[PDB]
Amino acid sequence: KEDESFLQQPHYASQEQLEDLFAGLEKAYPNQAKVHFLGRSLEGRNLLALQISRNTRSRNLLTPPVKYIANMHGDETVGRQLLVYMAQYLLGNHERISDLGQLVNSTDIYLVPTMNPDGYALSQEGNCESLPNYVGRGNAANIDLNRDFPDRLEAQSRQPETAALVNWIVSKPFVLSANFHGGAVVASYPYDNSLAHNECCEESLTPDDRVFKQLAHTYSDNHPIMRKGNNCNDSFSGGITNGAHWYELSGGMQDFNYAFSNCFELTIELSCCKYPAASTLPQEWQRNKASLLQLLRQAHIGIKGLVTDASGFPIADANVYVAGLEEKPMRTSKRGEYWRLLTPGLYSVHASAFGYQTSAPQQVRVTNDNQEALRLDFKLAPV
Numbered sequence: 006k007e008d009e010s011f012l013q014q015p016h017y018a019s020q021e022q023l024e025d026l027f028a029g030l031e032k033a034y035p036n037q038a039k040v041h042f043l044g045r046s047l048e049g050r051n052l053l054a055l056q057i058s059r060n061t062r063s064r065n066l067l068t069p070p071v072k073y074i075a076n077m078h079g080d081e082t083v084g085r086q087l088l089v090y091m092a093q094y095l096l097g098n099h100e101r102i103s104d105l106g107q108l109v110n111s112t113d114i115y116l117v118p119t120m121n122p123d124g125y126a127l128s129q130e131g132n133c134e135s136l137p138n139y140v141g142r143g144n145a146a147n148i149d150l151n152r153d154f155p156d157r158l159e160a161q162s163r164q165p166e167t168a169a170l171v172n173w174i175v176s177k178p179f180v181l182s183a184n185f186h187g188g189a190v191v192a193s194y195p196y197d198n199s200l201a202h203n204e205c206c207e208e209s210l211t212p213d214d215r216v217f218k219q220l221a222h223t224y225s226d227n228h229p230i231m232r233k234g235n236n237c238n239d240s241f242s243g244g245i246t247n248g249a250h251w252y253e254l255s256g257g258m259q260d261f262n263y264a265f266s267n268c269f270e271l272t273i274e275l276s277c278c279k280y281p282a283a284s285t286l287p288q289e290w291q292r293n294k295a296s297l298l299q300l301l302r303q304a305h306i307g308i309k310g311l312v313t314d315a316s317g318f319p320i321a322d323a324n325v326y327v328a329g330l331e332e333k334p335m336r337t338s339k340r341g342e343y344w345r346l347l348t349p350g351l352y353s354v355h356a357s358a359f360g361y362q363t364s365a366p367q368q369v370r371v372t373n374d375n376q377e378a379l380r381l382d383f384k385l386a387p388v
């Protein structure tokens with residue numbers, strides 16, 4: 006069975022240990038592991054993302070790009086190690102274990118163990134609670150990166166780390182995403198704030214709330230402890246919550262994904278203790294293992310397709326609308342691809358684009374039973 010050797014030596018991987026491991030994977034696995042440079046922190050540390058794919062050279066048409074980010078708050082560390090574990094796990098098992106082999110073949114996966122090296126470096130292993138000043142939580146300038154992203158409710162010069170990720174997030178048609186935090190145990194989804202700007206305990210839901218709730222439940226349902234809902238003195242029905250309803254915050258990465266791209270990002274809290282000890286890590290792995298795989302496979306629900314010429318040629322930046330979800334259109338990729346995550350049910354989908362007559366609508370029955378999103382294409386005539 007499984008090659009999970011990465012557990013035989015519980016410890017937190019340093020910046021050097023991380024760069025070193027990502028290079029090894031790249032040479033260990035020439036065609037499926039590739040390292041991407043996103044940028045650098047204030048203090049020179051590399052912000053890196055390991056891509057895993059069927060073929061790292063390109064992205065197969067209609068393969069969903071997805072990302073996992075961790076450790077944006079430097080003192081919230083478990084997610085960090087879990088992503089380090091995932092990388093090894095996927096690679097070293099994908100040819101041996103069918104499910105995984107199939108996961109990897111069908112999904113374009115990016116792993117970012119840390120997004121705040123400087124923050125991490127300043128944090129102290131063992132601290133369940135953050136430090137004085139919230140040192141380690143924010144970056145080297147002590148600003149909270151989860152307040153530093155553009156807000157949907159209203160041109161860089163943010164923190165290096167923010168800017169890097171902003172650039173990245175809009176650079177590819179990411180379909181699904183999650184970022185990991187510590188302090189509590191719960192699956193949180195958009196929106197994190199509202200026009201009312203309420204302190205807490207008031208839902209600020211998303212047009213795609215159903216799907217979001219399905220995503221959050223996918224992770225929590227598969228997490229033996231999160232599923233409970235009464236962790237760290239918190240009470241979260243079904244182990245999930247709306248960001249805003251928990252408490253509002255502005256400038257977060259989560260809502261930035263949704264509002265400025267196609268991407269559907271969840272916020273996931275892994276532990277009550279922000280920075281637990283290594284010996285804890287092997288347990289955290291076994292719990293989150295299923296929830297991290299199953300969530301990834303949620304990037305396959307709904308539909309996907311091509312908006313194309315009469316020349317049968319891809320229209321980029323086309324819009325694909327779903328009746329009742331018209332406030333969140335999908336914008337096609339340069340190759341005219343789109344993936345529209347959907348809850349089970351039946352929908353009328355249509356596509357439009359400037360200089361093109363808006364397509365006639367198509368009705369589709371979305372059962373999320375099969376391995377890959379239902380194909381559904383569009384040809385548009387120029388006006």
Ligand SMILES: N=C(N)NCCS[C@@H](CC(=O)O)C(=O)O
Nearest residue numbers: 151186187197248249251252254
């Ligand atoms: N209440 C909302 N909107 N989100 C909770 C998750 S992010 C939060 C908690 C964390 O850092 O883990 C933060 O402070 O950024």
Ligand SMILES: *[C@@H]1O[C@H](CO)[C@@H](O)[C@H](O)[C@H]1NC(C)=O
Nearest residue numbers: 059099100103105106107110
């Ligand atoms: C994944 O891709 C490999 C190589 O293309 C192929 O041999 C295999 O059938 C695919 N599916 C898996 C690993 O289940």
Ligand SMILES: [Zn+2]
Nearest residue numbers: 078081186187
């Ligand atoms: Zn956090």
